[PDB]
């Protein structure tokens, strides 16, 4: 058997956990608890949008007690251990998929867009107390389309332990799309532009380039079918921290037609000819604008692979 082998189990599966809970069942649930750990009544709408602090024993009231007949070993200690060990899958399967408390069902790891909201809510005192402090700075576990990432709030050192202070409602907690507080991990592939009388990024016409990607690092980021691709070009001021042009003044999708050695190559030809020239009429309307190229799967999925935000003539 190879390393992709995986099996079902008795510890993170069903049939073990029974209809029981080590917490108190009452008629003021869960709002009494939300206020009791400091959530303001002005923002009680978030009581069902974000869980109790994973740092406190109350969070684990939802599960059958670890001593009762048939219960899984689930405690705030076992949670933190798996967290710092990097066993994020066991957290999803043992705890997250079976929280199901606070009358909310779509508990998930927060997205990058959701941590951004959590930082704003924490600073504005709209959360529980322990989380109003927690989401100010630190390294936080995020999850976008089944993929784990660590986002940084406040520029903390890279060796700060990963924090997952609370899980959030997948749809109930509204994310913020602007990148301000939670700074992500964008991937930049090593690529060569062949230039010469070929690649061209100068005002007055269409932008064309011909890059070249390496196969071994495409397979590391989930790109083994080297024709299941699509390209995006962005025009605007890139983000000062990550370098991506998240809200470009001009966005354009194009499809490639290339087919060499231990690497494979891909073209790119903007449609700036035989239509509005406006790519160059906006790319070169402001000296701080830059042009960036992004690679996705054919339907826009996959690990987003970014080129540098170039100046004129790929500088």
């Amino acid at each position: 058997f190879n390393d992709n082998y995986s099996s079902t189990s008795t510890v993170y599966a069903t049939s073990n956990e029974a209809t029981d809970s080590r917490g108190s069942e009452h008629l003021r649930y869960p709002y009494l608890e939300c206020i009791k750990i400091g959530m303001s009544r002005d923002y009680l709408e978030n009581c069902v949008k974000v869980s109790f602090p994973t740092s406190q024993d109350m969070f684990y009231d939802a599960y059958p007690s670890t001593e009762s007949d048939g219960a899984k070993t689930r405690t705030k200690e076992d949670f933190s251990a798996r967290l710092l060990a990097g066993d994020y899958d066991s957290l999803q399967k043992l705890y997250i998929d079976f929280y199901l408390a606070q009358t909310t069902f779509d508990w998930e790891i927060p997205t990058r867009d959701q941590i951004e909201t959590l930082v704003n809510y924490a600073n504005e005192g709209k959360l529980s107390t322990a989380l109003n402090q927690e989401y100010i700075t630190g390294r936080f576990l995020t999850k976008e389309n089944g993929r784990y990432d660590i986002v940084n709030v406040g520029g903390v050192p890279d060796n700060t332990p990963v924090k997952l202070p609370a899980i959030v409602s997948k749809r109930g907690l509204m994310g913020t799309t602007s990148v301000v507080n939670a700074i992500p991990n964008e991937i930049y592939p090593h690529i060569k532009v062949y230039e010469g009388t070929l690649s061209r990024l100068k005002p007055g016409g269409a932008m064309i380039a011909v890059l070249e990607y390496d196969v071994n690092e495409l397979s590391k980021h989930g790109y083994t079918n080297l024709w299941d691709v699509q390209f995006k070009v962005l025009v605007g001021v890139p983000h000062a921290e990550t370098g991506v042009i998240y809200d470009p003044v001009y966005e354009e999708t194009v499809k490639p037609y290339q087919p060499l050695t231990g690497k494979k190559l891909y073209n790119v030809s903007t449609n700036d000819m035989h239509n509005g020239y406006k790519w160059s009429n906006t790319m070169f309307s402001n000296s701080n604008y830059k042009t960036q190229i992004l690679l996705t799967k054919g339907d826009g999925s996959g690990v987003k692979l970014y080129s540098k935000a170039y100046s004129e003539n790929f500088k």
Binding site: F1, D3, Y5, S6, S7, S9, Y12, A85, G86, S90
Partner: protein, 66 residues
């Protein structure tokens, strides 16, 4: 177990016996597939696999043919 302790015997899903001949030596590999979420994240016994485990006795048959 993932916490380093020795627990109860986990449940089983498969056993693989693989063998390859290279320069007058048979290289024998084995893998016992067990329920995941019990083994640590890394090591000989990791994820869902007990790699070339000692908890296995197999009978080796050899013969020659044309």
């Amino acid at each position: 177990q993932k916490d380093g302790s020795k627990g109860p015997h986990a449940l089983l899903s498969g056993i693989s016996l693989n063998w390859t001949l290279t320069n007058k030596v048979w290289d024998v590999t084995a893998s016992i597939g067990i329920e995941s979420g019990i083994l640590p994240t890394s090591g000989i016994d990791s994820g869902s696999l007990l790699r070339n485990p000692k908890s296995l006795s197999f009978i080796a048959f050899q013969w020659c043919e044309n």
